[PDB]
Amino acid sequence: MAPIAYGVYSQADGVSPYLKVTLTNSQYQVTGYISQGAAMNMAQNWEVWEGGTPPTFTLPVTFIALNNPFIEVSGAIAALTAMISPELKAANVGGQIPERVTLNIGRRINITDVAIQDLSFDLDAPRDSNGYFLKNTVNLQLTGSSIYNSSDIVRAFQ
Amino acid sequence: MAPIAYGVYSQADGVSPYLKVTLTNSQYQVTGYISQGAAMNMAQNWEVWEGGTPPTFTLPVTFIALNNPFIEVSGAIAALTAMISPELKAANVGGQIPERVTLNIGRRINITDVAIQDLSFDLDAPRDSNGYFLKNTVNLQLTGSSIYNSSDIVRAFQ
Amino acid sequence: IDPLLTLELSGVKTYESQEEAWGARLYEWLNTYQGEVYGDPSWGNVLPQFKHEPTNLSHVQIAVEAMLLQKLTVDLPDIPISGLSVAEGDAFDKLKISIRIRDITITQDVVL
Amino acid sequence: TRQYPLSRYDDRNIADPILRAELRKEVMLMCESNDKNLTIYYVLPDEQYRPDLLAYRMWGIAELRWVVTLAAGLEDESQGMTVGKKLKLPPATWIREMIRHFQYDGQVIGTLSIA
Amino acid sequence: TRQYPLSRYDDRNIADPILRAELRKEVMLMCESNDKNLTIYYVLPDEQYRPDLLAYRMWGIAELRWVVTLAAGLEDESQGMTVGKKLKLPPATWIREMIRHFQYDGQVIGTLSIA
Amino acid sequence: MSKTTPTKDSIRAEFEELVEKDSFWSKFVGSQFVSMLTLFITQIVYRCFQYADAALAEGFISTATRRSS
């Protein structure tokens, strides 16, 4: 079925599925919680209105190593850095891309193509006996693949 | 009569009509509350006075899903993003425009032509059982269609 | 006289009745599986991926629905998607996928 | 001052009745052809007097009035045309281009093979 | 408008059957050569009808269909080829380059010594 | 002398323009209906054509590459 997933992917967390943030691509899935501080912006350029700009997104997500840190924090951050990191030397020069992932929000608002342009977080949070992190707050900066039209945008929500 | 409207459009909210912000175009209407933080600015350029600048508006509006979130929050934000998003590929290349909306304030101060140049808000507010938002504060940035004259401006208020 | 049908035969000649026409086009998209069409075997429904997953693994269901919708959209940019709904049945043996382009609300009974 | 009254829309910009005639000939050919780049819309009851109302609402220009007049074959606006008749309109820029070609270099018209 | 249908992929862009023949000759030489810049993969059961199906999955283009057909030596897709046969595919750009050379200046082909 | 035949996208184009003769079916063009039927006829003609070409190629002594050939 789907490829490997990280974060609070299973229902065993016993948390509302709606409040879960999900990113999915052909080979990786990351699931997290909709944390405070999220924002988005769309705008245009003019001087006479010239044109528009693609959508922008600023999503901070908090991750908790409730039971299995290896799959919930370490694997999650590894997948995230793999996705943001442009893989342009994978011995396949005929098609190498920095790769884009699809975003699901509230299980009903879907962005088919969005680019993870920026990532940051802190590693100073406390750890476990093995040493894997217990908590983190990773903030993400995301861009639309194009300047989407009104017909493209308004009819994409549920 | 009028096309579809969103927000606190009906009187069933039992709130003073004067304090309602309204935007209207040929096919969409959005009604909300005059929230704190609103501001506006007009200015000119000089070096010898060269010329002027169009009016500018910064309107934060708060929306509450009192009874029907589908029509009051989700539909409202969808209409807003439709309006701000330039629809320049609607199979009608003979006339495509980013579209402008008309603004009514205090039911007495009307801006016939204003452009929604920027929109932003937060999605971290709590939701319902289905998952529609209960509350939001959307800030808007608006521009006049031209550098309006004194005869144009002063005689437009009530 | 004998009339005709739309399943891979004809709904209407071209897009006059817009929304039912798009629903028809999507219908012959979804009624075909991988490896059953020349040129673009990936074209058509991707049941061979989303066949028989556990009905309660909401993460995999949302992942597969998102990927299928995005690929069918990039496949047919003419018809964007408005509403997709997944509704379980009386028994564990019945699921329904309801796709509406704002009015069509055409539904198919799937099984996982 | 320098001023002259004119407008670059009139199909009758071509002073030849015969040339105007074949112009309306091929536009009729295309209109009652089933081309998909044509509009799909029926008749309105009030179009009897004013066939160009539809042109005004869906385009804002009355230059399509002769187009719809030849499409319906009306003898006079006093008489009416049946409501529900299949009416087809092509993109205006296409007509603008064809007439532009026909009044600059509308010589070969039919088919150009080689210089 | 100015439009012509064509596609710059067909190995049969060369109209000479004999030239196409030696082209498939050296591509077979390379394919059943054990060069490391070739792919290493076996047969799939459904490839009997659709040998180019693997070409579509690993490349997205069906231009490799004649390549795999000559690699397997199939008489017809009605018959099947044994699953597990060693199949080798070179980088597509390499074929594109060789055919580009052969249809601009594929004259010496074998070996150029000195001008 | 020599033999020639137009390419796949070509034969598709002249095929659709010639089927565009009858106004009652001319306009199914652009649809996945016509494209699927068109790709089907093009695949079958491609098989017959190119496989005959391969047969005439293998008919030569130095062109034989198959072990059986």
d(CA D11, CA D108): 19
Terminal-to-terminal C-alpha distance of chain C: 41
Residue A12 structure tokens = 């065993």
Taking the alpha carbons of C64, C70, C72, C74 in that order, is the dihedral positive or negative?
A: negative
Tally Cβ neighbours within 10 Å of residue D2: 3
- The DSSP element (H or E) to which F46 belongs, if any, is helix F32-58
Tally Cβ neighbours within 10 Å of residue A151: 16
Strand segments, DSSP code E, in E31-75 are: none
Q: What was the resolution (in A) of this experimentally determined structure?
A: 6.0
Residue B155 structure tokens = 């005689």
Disruptive mutation site among A105, A142, A152, A154 for chain B (greatest number of B CBs within 10 Å) = A154
With beta carbons less than 8 A apart as the criterion, state whether E40 and E28 touch.
no
With beta carbons less than 8 A apart as the criterion, state whether D85 and D42 touch.
yes
Closest CA in chain D for residue F30? D36
d(CA E53, CA E38): 18
Binary contact (F39, C38; C-beta < 8 A): yes
With beta carbons less than 8 A apart as the criterion, state whether B125 and A35 touch.
no
Provide the H-helix boundaries in chain B.
69, 75-84, 150-153
Residue E58 structure tokens = 């690993």
Label the pairing between strands B5-7 and B29-34.
parallel
Largest CA distance in chain B: 62
Residue A44 structure tokens = 């245009």
Residue D59 structure tokens = 């385009």
DSSP A154: G
Label the pairing between strands A109-120 and A101-105.
antiparallel
d(CA C67, CA C61): 10
d(CA D96, CA D101): 9
| 3-state class (DSSP) for residue E40 | coil
Binary contact (C59, A31; C-beta < 8 A): yes
Residue B100 structure tokens = 């402008």
- The DSSP element (H or E) to which B51 belongs, if any, is strand B49-52
- The DSSP element (H or E) to which B112 belongs, if any, is strand B109-121
With beta carbons less than 8 A apart as the criterion, state whether D66 and D73 touch.
no
d(CA F29, CA F35): 8
Smallest CA–CA separation between E107 and chain A, in Å? 28
With beta carbons less than 8 A apart as the criterion, state whether A55 and A144 touch.
yes
d(CA C110, CA C95): 5
Closest CA in chain C for residue D86? C16
Q: What are phi and psi of B14, to 5 degrees?
A: 65, 35
Q: Which residues in C lie closer than 8 A to residue A26 (C-beta atoms)?
A: 67
Sort B34 into a burial class: Cβ within 10 Å, 0-12 / 13-18 / 19+.
middle
With beta carbons less than 8 A apart as the criterion, state whether A35 and A13 touch.
no
d(CA B121, CA C40): 42
Residue A100 structure tokens = 């884009």
| 3-state class (DSSP) for residue A115 | strand
d(CA B119, CA B141): 6
Residue B131 structure tokens = 């998952």
Is D61 in the C-facing interface, judged by CB distances under 8 Å? no
DSSP A149: -
Q: Which residues in C lie closer than 8 A to residue D36 (C-beta atoms)?
A: 14-15
d(CA B70, CA B49): 51
Q: Which residue has the tokens 């220009």?
A: D61
Is A145 in the C-facing interface, judged by CB distances under 8 Å? no
- Axis-axis angle for helices F32-58, E65-72 (nearest 10): 40
Residue A94 structure tokens = 């005929």
d(CA C39, CA E61): 9
Q: Read off the amino acid at residue A26.
A: S
| 3-state class (DSSP) for residue B14 | coil
The percent helix, strand, coil of chain C (3-state, each to 5) is 30, 15, 55
| 3-state class (DSSP) for residue C51 | coil
Smallest CA–CA separation between E112 and chain F, in Å? 23
- The 8 Å CB, 24+ separation contacts for B34-41 are B34/B61, B34/B105, B34/B106, B35/B60, B35/B61, B35/B62, B35/B137, B36/B60, B37/B139
Provide the H-helix boundaries in A31-148.
69, 75-84
| 3-state class (DSSP) for residue E57 | helix
- The DSSP element (H or E) to which C100 belongs, if any, is strand C95-100
d(CA C46, CA B139): 42
d(CA E43, CA B40): 70
Sort A132 into a burial class: Cβ within 10 Å, 0-12 / 13-18 / 19+.
middle
Residue E85 structure tokens = 């046969």
With beta carbons less than 8 A apart as the criterion, state whether B29 and B5 touch.
yes
Count of residues making up chain B: 158
Taking the alpha carbons of B12, B15, B17, B23 in that order, is the dihedral positive or negative?
A: negative
Q: For chain A, after which residues does the C atom lie more than 2.5 Å from the next written residue's N, i.e. where is it broken? A: 47
d(CA B54, CA B113): 12
d(CA B145, CA A76): 48
